[PDB]
Design a protein around this ligand. Structure first.
Ligand SMILES: [Hg+2]
Ligand SMILES: [Hg+2]
Ligand SMILES: [Hg+2]
Ligand SMILES: [Hg+2]
Ligand SMILES: [Hg+2]
Ligand SMILES: [Hg+2]
Lengths: 161, 161, 161, 161, 161, 161
């Protein structure tokens, strides 16, 4: 169990097994971007290969932006445009209640069946917890969102004091 | 009149007056990203301040991706999701014929009236010319797309030989 | 109240409200560079717009370099050349005693009236606390140094053990 | 046919089909690093996915460093240590004469059978042409060096005047 | 005594006196790269000049990769190819037992006498401790590995919990 | 003789022998930053070691900013504050007439004797040619400005058409 502090964003979280940070700059402004290692280890000290069709973003959710249920739905809709900007239809929608050590939240999940029959279906899970924090886990039919792990990641969020 | 070569993307173009390149890395894979200087000059040798609500992207349009009229409409719809991922309504739509030294193309323009009444309206102009190249010019009601300059930029595109 | 550790520089500090880290690399060698958000929030996970006419630098002050009163005056004079390299006259000078949880220091403030009548006046506040640490807060007549917040930032410095 | 100038390194070359530049910084000091696109196109304007098990480096070969036949063999031996630092045996060695528009050179190729039976065999082709320039094309049994294309790349090198 | 946490790699370590972090990105995936300051201090807030012929890398050693004695020897052999890819002979070999607060490990050291008589001899110290962590300290005859400090660095490693 | 184009800044120039570009980003906005190699060659394809006490900046000189004689003196005074922000006295001043293929300009040179007796004297040469372009060559008593080469660099500037 690996806990990561994000002091600018005011929270800590548990790093999902098999994931690394994608860059350092997100932490400058209170966010975090994570990538999934492929499992093939790099030479020691060098950066590991990571998947290009899945990613996780988390951070403080600005008080100016966006109930946690309504917020996660709205954020999830916007995130899906930003990360999956191709025409398609939303299918297999779900909402999930969150409880991060007693701090309530909500998440919205859905899949995108793209108009392009050669594109794998997109998948997106967006959680809001709470001061408020968000978690977005993006994947595809070939590299699916791990819904149980996304819930565990959001429920691992703790405010820093 | 400043002409810029993009050898990986197979084209050259005229840099719009008052704009600079935003980074060098786009040219690595045959694209270009431009930013608009604010007019307040920096110390010599240092990077100029640029606007944060307008941008231009141009590059080779992959033969796998997307008539030029249909292509610019589809690309413009996707670009507007990617750059303006908030809910809203498309208004003030236009299409524009392009002629780049005899190479035909088409562009699609529209504005977005956002659901959020405090967001300025978004503006996007997307052109496809042609091997094919694209031009996307993004702005807002406070920093509008210069439609005549966007047409001139797309019509300035020349294949490199 | 957000406390940030800088382990290479041997100190922690309280992040001023409304400010973010400008990059990650400063911490590699025991410094920190901060930028002021404009208040217009970015899309979640993306970097916020920041002001281009104000900045804060802090870090360990090398034992080889530069009383804390004399040190802050000398450092402030050099910092003003580095950040405001245009001809002008220093006006509205002040010195300020510092007490960081019992660790004494001193700061030097002044404004620059530039020879160029179209340049807004520059403002710089430079503090030395203490092992020694420095704080430099730069602004202009349009985006002034918050002198009370600069004193609070310097007095928030704690050695790490 | 896409020709790329490298003014600091004093040469131009033909970009192999399906390859892009990996970064811009190599050109600062007269080299070039190329990566192979996977074929899955990115969103327009965004960087394409590239293979992680093949790469090409080319540049001016310092007059202080390293006949072209002896030079390519020595450089190839060193490059194979640098890029394939695991124990193994060199097999399937070849040397290839080069003629770049009348400028002679030589290349050395070999494969590495690694001690680790789960590692795919490494492949490396190293050419020296000539002022002198080098070309290194690295691959594996799963993503082999295209020997004909590596020879064409080295023979495409032209001095800039 | 300066202790640095590496949460992705699951460890903390004591920063050797006179060394700084070379970049921030290594920590993204659980490694750290350190550079040695030259002693000439930079302007405050700016990065210090560092030596170009010595470096330290440390990180988690993948369970898939590589007894600690055998592991450090094998890793040291591979690291010496990666960092010193020129022909030469290994001389002055040593192995060193490690004890990091009761966690055992081993290190392998050797020097390289290069075929090129104008190259200074290379030096490399590679330690494995332990979950397992590695430490590599690289130097030359002109800027030698500090063997006592490398042992202290490896023995300063503590798992994070 | 190596000529480099800077299309955003509207000029080309001859690269001084032994110098490389320091980064790619300066060209994005019409400037160039050059560093001096130490002569010790790197491994092929890797960046060469460069001096840390000398540098060259060149670029378009904004029509809003700053006769060429008065301009070079004023720019040289400001550049010396920016690059040598320590107290001292200007000595050994010179001005130099420039003629870049018939385009006139002027340069201002001076040395700085620092108050700190352990700092080597600073040296700065600043030229303005002309649309106008600037050249700044910075050095020290240990790594002096090559005045003849700085004049040749400024006189090598040609407008791009
Ligand atoms: Hg994957
Ligand atoms: Hg603007
Ligand atoms: Hg501002
Ligand atoms: Hg591949
Ligand atoms: Hg050194
Ligand atoms: Hg030097």
């Amino acid at each position: 169990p690996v806990r990561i502090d994000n002091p600018v964003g005011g929270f800590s979280f548990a790093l999902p097994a098999g994931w690394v940070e994608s860059d350092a700059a997100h932490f400058d402004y209170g966010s975090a971007l994570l990538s999934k290692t492929t499992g093939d280890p790099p030479f020691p000290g060098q950066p590991p290969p990571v998947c290009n069709d899945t990613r996780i973003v988390l951070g403080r959710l600005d008080q100016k932006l966006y109930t946690d249920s309504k917020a996660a739905a709205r954020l999830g809709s916007d995130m899906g445009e930003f990360y999956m900007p191709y025409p398609g239809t939303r299918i297999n929608q779900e909402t999930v209640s969150l409880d991060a050590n007693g701090v309530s939240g909500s998440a919205s999940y859905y899949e995108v069946k793209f108009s392009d029959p050669s594109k794998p279906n997109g998948q997106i899970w967006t959680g809001v917890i709470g001061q408020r924090w968000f978690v977005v886990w993006l994947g595809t039919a070939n590299n699916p969102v791990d819904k149980g792990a996304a819930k565990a990641l959001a429920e691992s969020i703790r405010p820093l004091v």
